[PDB]
Design a protein around this ligand. Structure first.
Ligand SMILES: O=C1N[C@]2(CO1)C[C@H](C(=O)N1CCC(COc3ccc(F)cc3Cl)CC1)C2
Length: 288
């Protein structure tokens, strides 16, 4: 019997099969009635759909049907951990899952919510179906490579390394930079479904593919979006959020900055987390 990397059978778990025959674990948060709209939740690197529990519960509370899967190589889905053949696998797999739910709930609007790498995936998802999605919620999305370590030299070097040692990794990224809320850094550090191993060069390069593709997609992007960004984010610099507001052609685009906040705004200090949930609530309410 096919098992998750944690050794639980796929027979017992909500799942789907991708174009490459891999099993992706699925979560659903369905309202009692016929829902107003659908929203797919797109998690980031090293994490999984289960971290979106509170956000999903709140969005179901608004009569939306929330759905998600664990990306290839993440959480309860198959694949070598935090590697991907090409970054477009993540996007293809979101579009597979979206098309399936729309056949089941036709003539409904569909939204995207993405954080970090998941925001990159949300943007590329909407860029490939221009005019299809009703709205996009981005929490500190990946849009921009850190400029000190994205030099002509350090990219070529990365590519040369990839061709010899694709599995070569740097240290684990200091997880203290995720959130000022030390409880949430402790919850991250003790969740068995999170991969905290160092990033491999082959994955490093696919994240640069994502950055390049997001930046080239920004000028042709017209989907409504809410963008939430922390000023002291050491993983996705606040500059990238400003760039998204400059280059996107979307007529309906809103930026909120959280002064002094780190990367995981939905798991930040309660003052920030509550404002984040409230603003996602308000923005989705008005557009449904
Ligand atoms: O709650 C949460 N948030 C998470 C974890 O759990 C943060 C994680 C997530 O998506 N990223 C954080 C790390 C970052 C690395 O970036 C790179 C590294 C090497 C490279 F060569 C090019 C790039 Cl761009 C990408 C985005 C989701």
């Amino acid at each position: 019997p096919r098992r998750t990397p944690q050794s639980i059978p796929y027979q017992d778990l909500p799942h789907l099969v991708n174009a490459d025959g891999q099993y992706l674990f699925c979560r659903y948060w369905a309202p009692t009635g016929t829902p107003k709209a659908l929203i797919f939740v797109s998690h980031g690197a090293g994490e999984h759909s289960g971290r979106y529990e509170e956000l999903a519960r709140m969005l179901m509370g608004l009569d939306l049907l929330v759905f998600a899967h664990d990306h290839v190589g993440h959480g309860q889905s198959e694949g070598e951990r935090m590697v991907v053949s090409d970054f477009h696998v993540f996007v293809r797999d979101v579009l597979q899952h979206v098309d399936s739910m729309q056949k089941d709930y036709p003539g409904l609007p569909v939204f995207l919510l993405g954080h970090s790498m998941g925001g990159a995936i949300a943007i590329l998802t909407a860029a490939e179906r221009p005019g299809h999605f009703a709205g996009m919620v981005l929490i500190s999305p990946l849009v921009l490579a850190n400029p000190e370590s994205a030099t002509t030299f350090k990219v070529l070097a990365a590519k040369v390394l990839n061709s010899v040692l694709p599995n070569l990794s740097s240290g684990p990224i200091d997880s203290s930079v995720l959130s000022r809320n030390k409880t949430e850094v402790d919850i991250y550090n003790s969740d068995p479904l999170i991969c905290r191993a160092g990033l491999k060069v082959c994955f490093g390069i696919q994240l640069l593919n994502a950055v390049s593709r997001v930046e080239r997609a920004l000028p042709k992007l017209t989907v409504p979006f809410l963008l939430l960004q922390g000023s002291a984010d050491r993983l996705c610099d606040s500059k990238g959020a400003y760039l998204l507001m400059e280059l996107a052609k979307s007529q309906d685009k809103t930026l909120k900055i959280y002064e002094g906040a780190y990367h995981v705004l939905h798991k930040e200090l309660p003052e920030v987390t509550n404002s984040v949930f409230h603003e996602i609530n308000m923005w989705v309410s008005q557009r449904t």
